[PDB]
């Protein structure tokens, strides 16, 4: 008998919550880097197949890049919204750069 | 219905939809040699009344276009003389259910 | 995702539009002007790409929102372009409108009335009214303006009335109706409009010509040439190539978009423009560039090296060029060369932003543009939206385990201490979580973290037992803060033994490869443990395979993995409704031994085997006390039979309230093996007692109508699972006490059996030469060394077809000798025999191997077949250097007489190696893309609450699933009437009707079913076209889930036929009700993704047909011709012609020949050209044909037919070929005194032919045709033979259009038919005397559609796809095929699953995630399209819950207080 | 016009390979077979059965 050099699971990994890429905010690739297991198009198709919409939501959103983001209802955008800078006593409020008018320009 | 022999002049073909509400249908006698609705793979196509269509669109809460389509120039559509909007009932034999009623809208 | 953090607002729809320059300038956080990114020291330069106003960068706070790198979302900036630029994505469109417009009146060159006609048609199409858009063309009255303006008024009047009329009713909303067919009609018009727009040369409004605009690959437009005739009219315009700047084009389009605003309003709006926005030309131009936030332009850090931003390199280059060109144009004010570099700078700035966005459409490795970023490889949509890397997931090599449940997974403690669930702390679980908190993150079952109600997290990782004990006593403390009193603490607890996990084995070809398993943490484990019952569904073999474990983090996802995607419901696959669960190897071999007559057991042994597999403490029992049968032998010694153990296992796992199972099945092992008069093949179960027959792979394997499947139908899926786990343990324990082995003794033949082997193989030596003498055609069987035979075999060697005939004949003959050896020696000649011969036992049981493998081991390997033929042979005629050239021996051809037990002769062994290697390469070389194309177009298709099959956008695909609404995973025992009868009271208790009788109707449908049966019996002998259409099916009129009796006519006919043919306390009327109720309970659930399931049911089994042919296209290439490409040009187009009974076998063969057609080449034997150079080049072309009676009996061609073709076609074709060759060059019996009728014929031919000068044809005998050709002295040398040859095989004497050959095959299933190698229905229509024109079949779908219609083509698709699967003996439910065909015929045409067919689809997001993302996005923006977010793809893009299955409804809470 | 055989007759070409196996269609003893090594070098051999009474093809690995 001959013992083959390969470890059985050299690719043995487990990830709960590890590092994420800046652009996608999704688990980064790399077993040793505490990386994420990819749920590809075929696994997406299989989760649609069972009619199991919360499992798909769980993999492709909830446990991937789920972000509670600010949106302006007036113009419908996530990129124009920003946290306002308040005074010593005042509180910061989420404001839209697009729909807001420059104070001086507001004339009667 | 105008059954022509070999071909029709392109100038003469323009006179076909020139007199509404009267409709003109052209057919080549070589293409009429065999009836297509007699073929085993061609099910029974039945043109529905404006009331029968109205009822079908209600039962399934459908919009005219939201239905499976049949081309206005489809061989069977040309046979029954279908107009745009007219719904056709197709009784097709299935090798799972037997007689099955399906429908198609002529656009 | 946090349940403590709910969201009150939701995105309902996405609107595609263009950003205006004015809009960007206001929202911008900072104007970017500097090409440098960093100042000295290391701070970002003010006005640069890294400005802090664009967000927090380099440990500095954002200068807009003030937050740090974590909380700052980043802010958009802008670059002010000094001159407007063409937007690359919309350049093609602005180009179309530039070429289509007049440069004088600034209107489109197309007549205003024609333009208004398009605007009218496009306005009516904003609402779902296509019929009205066509009816507008009927509105009709060089034409006066007063008359044309009345036509525009009458047309506008009809448009306003047709909209209002449809608006009054529920035909269209204020927002307008939009369907795929509506979209198809819009796309057709917008195309036709632009085609008519571009076609006009001279403006129809003002008769002046405009100068034509030309274009290059890059975004740049220029002027065109102009002949004198065009000049003569550009000068009379007033009487009655040069580059054009971006500003000039914008200024031309500015006026045109103002003057033609009415039509463009509907050209650019898919639905009515309720926003009332003006369609401006500046949308196609860029006066500014938005600068994305620093957040999405961060420099990539790889280890120590911090790479410069990929985006900042090309973007800074654009800024350098912008600043350089605005200054190089500023010094020009104080003024050739300055204009030259100014124009050159105007070009390099447009090419700079073009490089900023794209490559392949730039240069000719460059920096990738934003288009390239969205389509890097598969694309951003495919790699990061449709698919994603996930949290709370693990991967490991799978190891087998029979001690865990079939619904469980063995989780290593390594994974258990890392994978956590957010468990909210409550009064009912405070005890359980307090322990987990104390235990911590390294002791299982523990907890890694604790989340307080304020939202903060407390890690338990660094803490000692003391702090953990303190936090545990603080878990259920009441929230002091009123803003979080609603909330309760969470504990991120270790994965326990009660949790669900998603097990995945890639490739996930079908949903069964992704099931839900129950976690079972096994101590001291380093691998994922999996039970053998799961091996089939995952298609996972424990050969070092890897599996993915997903740990869903919420209860809704838990419930789904435990009740929908869980393993228990996967016993039957939806592909064929057959089992995919069962025991695989040791258990099958164990069962054949345990259930054998010879197997006896003492009280001690018997009771041990019972408790060994059935443990009441683990809830395996149903009686709370292990019940035991009495012994089968009382005196002398008390003994139990092996079969009694199987009876006792069922007696303790099946419910006590229900009666025992009754089944009469069969075995894989024939009675002959068990001796004389045994009935051990007949599997008999009477009142849950195994009384006859052993149990094979055919009973407790993944095999239909076996014991496990029978138990599954009578007692349910939970009991069948228990039986599988119980049997699985029993056989494991039995294999431990009573082992199973395989050895040399199982491979040996007896001295008698080995004698038979040598004697049958002694006749094989003659076979080699016998077959070689048959194909060669030689009487009395010539010797092997015959010189004429060796010359004849050489002829065969040089031709691929001739060698094929030799190989197929010799193979069939030697394989007949093989079959004889195997039939004699196995098993009647084997030394050790079944049940003791384990090698034989494993093949018969179905545990592992077959009788073919057994025969290669004990008898012979046989003929080594290579790519359908024998062994390859060298140019020398030698198959090996050892064999003689043209050796007429079976061994030389690859026939191996040797077996693996005795060994293979060196010569034989080399041949075997060739066969082995060939098998290996095909596996490596040869369903991914085929399935991907179907799934992307069918993802949305599901079952609606109105039982119809509807797409994602609500468009109807089918009125009912397969026409009967039955779930394939239920349609199994629905025809097993005897089974259902034997288990009447068991199933009546299962399908409890007492809680349903008040919710359904018992007569309405049952009465109607009789009325339809009445009219059906009346027109039984009548044809389908003459059949009554009075009453349509009962399923069409009554809902199957509400009316008892609304059943498919197929089920109705089958059920009634059973009650008539079988007269048997159950009445024939009460049984009818039970079966009616069974059908009701077998209905497909509304929400079921029948679309994905269908594509998975066609994809997954199409992997089994990756191997090559053993004429027509088969397997995946044929499936691709249909589903993937919908080819109108099929590789093997055929026609099946049903011949009558009055037409004989000889008459049909004569008819085949008649359709059969000869060519001039086919009747010619020799051509002799006697080139004599004289005066004049004289060419004497003599056509020596075959004998007149020979070609007349082989092609049905007369001598008269040959005369007409040569005298009219051939000579005219030959003369044209010689003239063309002249231009290309410069760029025995004696016949004499020909006479009278012949002289007049020759003289007439001389007048019709220029160079032949002569033309004499054999009119009496009909064997030759001689004609002389006279050429000029300047024509010189020419290769006439080669010229003649080519024209002969090009000259047609005969042929029926589009048909090549008509053949007569063996009658297919009793039907007398003729298979054509071509398609032309109209030609076969004339052969009514021979062919039944109402039964003429064809494989070509497009050809069928063109002649017989969409429904006929639809029927061809379901039949042809079925032929592909039936050939490889794969059964796919017609419900899948019918759905696929209905989707291909949804538009009334023949659409394929590809980019072309998809064009007519509502979801632009679905389209973007398929291919050409930026292209589909451009088409969406130009339509001003609203993505309704109703397709699975679109929902995934915006993070919305999928509308399929659990997302097909809403959950509302009933609250008591007013 | 070729001295050797160039074409096979309509039915004069019999299937040589035959093995004793129970027919799932009705019940026949004589049944044809075919061998080819599909998939990877680790995967087993697939058997292609064929009936003589009707003429029905088949595909099953084990
Ligand atoms: Zn806003
Ligand atoms: Zn900020
Ligand atoms: Zn004009
Ligand atoms: Zn048979």
Curated annotation (Swiss-Prot), chain A:
Domain of life of the native organism: Eukaryota
Gene name per UniProt: RPA135
Function: DNA-dependent RNA polymerases catalyze the transcription of DNA into RNA using the four ribonucleoside triphosphates as substrates. Component of RNA polymerase I (Pol I) which synthesizes ribosomal RNA precursors. Besides, RNA polymerase I has intrinsic RNA cleavage activity. RPA190 and RPA135 both contribute to the polymerase catalytic activity and together form the Pol I active center. In addition, subunit RPA12 contributes a catalytic zinc ribbon that is required for RNA cleavage by Pol I.
Other remarks in the entry: Three distinct zinc-containing RNA polymerases are found in eukaryotic nuclei: polymerase I for the ribosomal RNA precursor, polymerase II for the mRNA precursor, and polymerase III for 5S and tRNA genes. Present with 14100 molecules/cell in log phase SD medium.
Boundaries of the shown chain within the full protein: 1033 to 1140 of 1203
Family, similarity comment: Belongs to the RNA polymerase beta chain family.
Zinc finger regions, C4-type: 72-99
Name under which the protein is recorded: DNA-directed RNA polymerase I subunit RPA135
Native organism: Saccharomyces cerevisiae (strain ATCC 204508 / S288c)
Subcellular location(s) per record: Nucleus, Nucleolus
From Swiss-Prot, chain B:
Sequence similarity: Belongs to the archaeal Rpo5/eukaryotic RPB5 RNA polymerase subunit family.
Source superkingdom: Eukaryota
Subcellular location: Nucleus
Disulfide bonds: none
Part of the intact protein present: 109 to 215 of 215
Protein name according to UniProt: DNA-directed RNA polymerases I, II, and III subunit RPABC1
Organism: Saccharomyces cerevisiae (strain ATCC 204508 / S288c)
Lineage: Eukaryota, Fungi, Dikarya, Ascomycota, Saccharomycotina
Purpose of the protein: DNA-dependent RNA polymerases catalyze the transcription of DNA into RNA using the four ribonucleoside triphosphates as substrates. Common component of RNA polymerases I, II and III which synthesize ribosomal RNA precursors, mRNA precursors and many functional non-coding RNAs, and small RNAs, such as 5S rRNA and tRNAs, respectively. Pol II is the central component of the basal RNA polymerase II transcription machinery. RNA polymerase complexes are composed of mobile elements that move relative to each other.
From Swiss-Prot, chain C:
SMART domains in alphabetical order: RPOLA_N (SM00663)
Chain spans, region Bridging helix: 906-918
CDD domains: RNAP_I_Rpa1_C (cd02735), RNAP_I_RPA1_N (cd01435)
Compartments where found: Nucleus, Nucleolus
Keyword Phosphoprotein: yes
Record protein name field: DNA-directed RNA polymerase I subunit RPA190
Residues holding Zn(2+) 2: 102, 105, 203, 206
Binding site for Mg(2+): 541, 543, 545
From Swiss-Prot, chain D:
Assembly description: Component of the RNA polymerase I (Pol I) complex consisting of 14 subunits: RPA135, RPA190, RPC40, RPA14, RPB5, RPO26, RPA43, RPB8, RPA12, RPB10, RPC19, RPC10, RPA49 and RPA34. The complex is composed of a horseshoe-shaped core containing ten subunits (RPA135, RPA190, RPB5, RPO26, RPB8, RPB10, RPC10, RPA12, RPC19 and RPC40) where RPA135 and RPA190 form the DNA-binding cleft. Outside of the core, RPA14 and RPA43 form the stalk that mediates interactions with transcription initiation factors and newly synthesized RNA. Interacts with RPA2/RPA135.
UniProt-annotated binding residues for Zn(2+) 2: 23, 26, 51, 54
Region (Required for RNA cleavage, but not essential for elongation activity): 16-62
Gene: RPA12
Official protein name in the record: DNA-directed RNA polymerase I subunit RPA12
Zinc fingers (TFIIS-type), renumbered ranges: 19-59
Location(s), subcellular: Nucleus, Nucleolus
Family, per entry: Belongs to the archaeal RpoM/eukaryotic RPA12/RPB9/RPC11 RNA polymerase family.
Additional facts recorded: Present with 8450 molecules/cell in log phase SD medium.
């Amino acid at each position: 008998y001959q013992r083959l050099r390969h470890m059985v699971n050299d690719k043995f990994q487990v990830r709960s919550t590890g590092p994420v890429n800046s652009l996608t905010m999704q688990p980064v690739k790399g077993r040793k880097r505490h990386g994420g297991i990819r749920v590809g198009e075929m696994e997406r198709d299989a989760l649609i197949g069972h009619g199991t919409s919360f499992l798909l939501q769980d993999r492709l959103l909830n446990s991937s890049d789920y972000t509670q983001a600010s949106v302006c209802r007036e113009c419908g955008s996530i990129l124009t919204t920003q946290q306002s800078v308040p005074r010593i006593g005042s509180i910061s409020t989420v404001c839209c750069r697009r729909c807001s008018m420059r104070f001086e320009d507001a004339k009667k | 219905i105008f059954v022509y022999q070999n071909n029709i002049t392109p100038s003469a073909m323009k006179l076909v939809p020139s007199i509404p509400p009267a409709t003109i249908e052209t057919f080549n006698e070589a293409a009429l040699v065999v009836n297509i609705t007699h073929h085993e793979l061609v099910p029974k196509h039945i043109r529905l009344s404006s009331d029968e269509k109205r009822e079908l669109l209600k039962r399934y809460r459908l919009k005219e276009s939201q239905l499976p389509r049949i081309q206005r120039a489809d061989p069977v559509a040309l046979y029954l003389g279908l107009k745009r909007g007219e719904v056709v009932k197709i009784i097709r034999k299935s090798e799972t259910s037997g007689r099955y009623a399906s429908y198609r809208i002529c656009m | 995702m946090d349940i403590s953090k709910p969201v009150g607002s939701e995105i309902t729809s996405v609107d595609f539009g263009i950003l205006t320059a004015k809009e960007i300038r206001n929202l911008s956080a900072k104007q970017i002007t500097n090409p440098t990114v960093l100042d000295n020291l290391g701070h970002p330069v003010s006005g640069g790409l890294y400005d802090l106003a664009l967000g927090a960068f380099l440990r500095n706070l954002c200068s807009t929102c003030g937050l740090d790198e974590k909380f700052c979302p980043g802010h958009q900036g802008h670059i002010e372009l000094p001159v407007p630029c063409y937007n690359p994505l919309f350049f093609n469109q602005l180009y179309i409108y530039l070429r289509a417009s007049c440069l004088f009146c600034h209107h489109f060159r197309l007549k205003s009335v024609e333009v208004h006609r398009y605007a009218c048609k496009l306005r009516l199409l904003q609402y779902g009214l296509i019929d009205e858009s066509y009816k507008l063309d009927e509105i009709t009255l060089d034409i006066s303006s007063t008359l044309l303006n009345e036509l525009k008024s009458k047309r506008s009047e009809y448009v306003d009335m047709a909209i209002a009329k449809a608006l009054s009713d529920g035909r269209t909303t204020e927002r307008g109706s939009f369907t795929a067919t509506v979209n198809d009609e819009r796309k057709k018009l917008v195309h036709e409009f632009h085609k008519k727009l571009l076609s006009r040369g001279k403006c129809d409004n003002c008769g002046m010509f405009s100068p034509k605009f030309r274009k290059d690959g890059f975004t740049k437009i220029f002027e065109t040439a102009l002949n004198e005739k065009q000049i003569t009219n550009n000068r009379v315009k007033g009487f009655i190539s040069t580059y054009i700047l971006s500003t000039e084009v914008k200024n031309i389009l500015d006026t045109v978009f103002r003057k033609e605003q009415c039509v463009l309003q509907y050209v650019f709006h898919s639905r009515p423009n309720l926003s009332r926005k003006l369609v401006k030309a500046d949308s196609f131009f860029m006066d500014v560039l938005v600068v994305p936030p620093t957040r999405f332009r961060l420099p990539s850090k790889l280890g120590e090296e911090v790479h410069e931003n990929s985006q900042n390199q090309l973007l800074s280059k654009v800024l350098t060029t912008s600043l350089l060109i605005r200054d190089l144009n500023d010094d020009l004010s104080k003024l050739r060369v300055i204009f030259s570099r100014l124009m050159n700078a105007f070009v390099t700035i447009q090419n700079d932003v073009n490089a900023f966005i794209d490559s392949t459409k730039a240069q000719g490795v460059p920096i990738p543009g934003v288009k390239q970023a969205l389509e890097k490889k598969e694309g951003l949509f495919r790699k990061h939206m449709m698919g994603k890397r996930v949290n709370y997931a693990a991967r490991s090599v799978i190891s087998p385990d029979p001690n865990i449940e079939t619904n469980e997974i063995g989780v290593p403690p390594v994974f258990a201490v890392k994978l956590t669930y957010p468990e909210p702390v409550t009064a009912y679980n405070i005890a359980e979580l307090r322990q987990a908190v104390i235990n911590g993150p390294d002791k299982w079952p523990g907890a890694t973290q604790i989340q307080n109600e304020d939202g903060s997290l407390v890690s338990l990782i660094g803490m000692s037992v003391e702090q953990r004990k303190a936090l545990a006593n603080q878990l259920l403390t009441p929230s002091s803060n009123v803003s979080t009193h609603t909330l309760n603490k969470k504990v991120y607890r270790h994965i326990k033994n009660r949790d669900v996990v998603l097990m995945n084995r890639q490739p996930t070809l079908h949903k069964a490869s992704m099931m839900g398993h129950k976690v079972r943490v096994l101590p001291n484990e380093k691998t994922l443990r999996l039970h053998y019952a799961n091996t089939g569904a995952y298609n996972a073999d424990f050969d070092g395979d890897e599996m993915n474990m997903h740990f869903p983090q919420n209860e809704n996802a838990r419930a789904e993995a435990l009740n929908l995607a869980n393993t228990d419901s996967q016993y039957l696959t939806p592909t064929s409704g057959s089992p995919v669960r069962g025991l695989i190897q040791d258990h099958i071999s164990a069962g054949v031994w345990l259930t054998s007559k010879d197997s006896f057991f003492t009280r001690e042994q018997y009771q041990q085997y019972i408790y060994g597999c059935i443990r009441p403490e683990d809830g395996h029992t149903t009686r709370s006390k292990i019940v035991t049968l009495p012994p089968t032998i009382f005196k002398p010694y008390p003994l139990w039979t092996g079969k009694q153990i199987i009876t006792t296992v069922l007696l303790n796992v099946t419910p006590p309230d229900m009666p025992g199972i009754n089944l009469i099945s069969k075995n894989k092992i024939k009675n002959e093996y068990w001796g004389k008069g045994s009935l051990e093949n007949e599997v008999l179960f009477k009142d849950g007692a195994l009384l006859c027959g052993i149990l094979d792979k055919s009973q407790y394997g993944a095999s239909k109508y076996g014991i496990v499947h029978s138990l599954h139908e009578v007692y349910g899926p939970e009991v069948a699972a228990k039986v599988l786990s119980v049997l699985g343990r029993l056989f494991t324990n039995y294999i431990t006490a009573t082992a199973f082995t395989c050895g040399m003794d199982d491979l040996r033949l007896t001295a008698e059996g080995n004698k038979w082997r040598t004697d049958i193989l002694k006749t094989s030596v003659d076979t080699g030469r016998e077959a070689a003498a048959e194909v060669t055609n030689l009487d009395k069987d010539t010797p092997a060394d015959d010189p004429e035979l060796l010359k004849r075999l050489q002829e065969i060697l040089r031709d691929n077809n001739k060698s094929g005939i030799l190989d197929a004949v010799t193979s069939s003959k030697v394989n007949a000798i093989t079959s004889q050896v195997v039939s004699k020696c196995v098993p009647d000649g084997t030394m050790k025999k079944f049940p003791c011969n384990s090698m034989q036992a494993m093949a018969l049981s179905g545990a592992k191997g077959s009788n073919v493998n057994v025969s290669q081991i004990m008898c012979l390997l046989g003929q080594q077949a290579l790519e359908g033929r024998r062994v390859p042979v060298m140019v020398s005629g030698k198959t090996l250097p050892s064999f003689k050239p043209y050796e007429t021996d079976a061994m030389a051809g690859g026939y191996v007489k040797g077996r693996f037990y005795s060994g293979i002769k060196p010569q034989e062994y080399y041949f075997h190696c060739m066969a082995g290697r060939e098998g290996l390469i095909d596996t490596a070389v040869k369903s991914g893309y085929l399935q991907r194309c179907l799934t992307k177009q069918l993802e949305g298709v599901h079952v609606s609450y109105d039982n119809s099959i509807r797409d994602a956008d609500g468009t109807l695909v089918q009125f009912m699933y397969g026409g009967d609404a039955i779930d394939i995973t239920k349609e199994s025992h629905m025809t097993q009437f005897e089974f259902c009868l034997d288990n009447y009271y068991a199933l009546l208790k299962k399908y409890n009707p007492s809680a349903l009788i008040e919710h359904l109707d018992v007569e309405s449908a049952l009465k109607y079913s009789k009325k339809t049966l009445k009219y059906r019996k009346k027109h039984s002998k009548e044809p389908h076209y003459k059949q009554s259409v009075k009453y349509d099916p009962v399923l069409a009129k009554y809902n199957p889930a509400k009316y008892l009796g609304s059943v498919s006519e197929n089920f109705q006919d089958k059920l009634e036929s059973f009650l008539d043919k079988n007269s048997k306390g159950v009445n024939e009327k009460k049984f009818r009700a039970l079966m009616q109720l069974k059908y009701m309970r077998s209905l497909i659930n509304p929400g079921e993704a029948v679309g994905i399931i269908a594509s998975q049911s066609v994809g997954e089994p199409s992997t089994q047909m990756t191997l090559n042919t053993f004429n027509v296209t088969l397997g995946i290439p044929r499936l691709r011709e249909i589903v993937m490409t919908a080819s109108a040009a099929i590789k093997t187009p055929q026609m099946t012609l049903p011949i009558w009974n009055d037409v004989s076998d000889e008459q049909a063969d004569t008819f085949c020949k008649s359709i059969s057609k000869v060519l001039l080449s086919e009747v010619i034997d020799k051509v002799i050209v006697t080139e004599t150079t004289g005066t004049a080049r004289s060419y004497v072309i003599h056509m020596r044909f075959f004998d007149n009676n020979e070609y007349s009996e082989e092609y049905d061609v007369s001598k008269e037919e040959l005369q007409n073709v040569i005298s009219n076609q051939f000579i005219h074709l030959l003369e044209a070929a010689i003239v063309k060759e002249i231009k290309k060059q410069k760029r025995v019996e004696a016949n004499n005194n020909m006479n009278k009728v012949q002289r007049d014929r020759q003289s007439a031919i001389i007048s019709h032919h220029r160079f032949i000068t002569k033309y004499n044809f054999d009119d009496e005998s009909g064997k030759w045709c001689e004609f002389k050709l006279e050429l000029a002295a300047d024509t010189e040398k020419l290769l006439m033979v080669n010229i003649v040859e080519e024209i002969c095989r090009k000259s047609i004497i005969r042929q029926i259009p589009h048909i090549d050959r008509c053949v007569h095959p063996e009658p297919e299933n009793g039907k007398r038919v003729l298979v054509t190698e071509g398609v032309n229905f109209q030609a076969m229509w004339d052969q009514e005397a021979f062919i039944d024109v109402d039964g003429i079949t064809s494989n070509d779908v497009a050809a069928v559609l063109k002649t017989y219609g969409v429904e006929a083509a639809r029927n061809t698709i379901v039949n042809e796809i079925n032929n592909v699967f039936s050939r490889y003996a794969i059964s796919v439910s017609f419900r899948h095929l019918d759905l696929i065909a209905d989707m291909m015929t949804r538009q009334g045409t023949y659409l394929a699953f590809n980019r072309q067919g998809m064009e007519t689809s509502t979801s632009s997001f679905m389209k973007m995630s398929y291919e050409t993302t930026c292209q589909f996005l451009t088409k969406a923006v130009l339509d001003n399209e609203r993505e309704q977010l109703d397709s699975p793809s679109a929902r995934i893009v915006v993070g919305k819950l999928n509308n399929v299955g659990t997302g097909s409804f809403d959950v509302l809470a009933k609250v008591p207080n007013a | 016009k070729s001295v050797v055989k160039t074409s096979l007759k309509k039915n004069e070409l019999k299937d040589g390979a035959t093995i004793k196996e129970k027919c799932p269609q009705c019940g026949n003893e004589e049944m044809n077979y075919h061998t080819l090594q599909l998939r990877s070098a680790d995967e087993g051999a697939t058997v292609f059965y064929t009936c003589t009474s009707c003429g029905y093809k088949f595909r099953t690995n084990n």
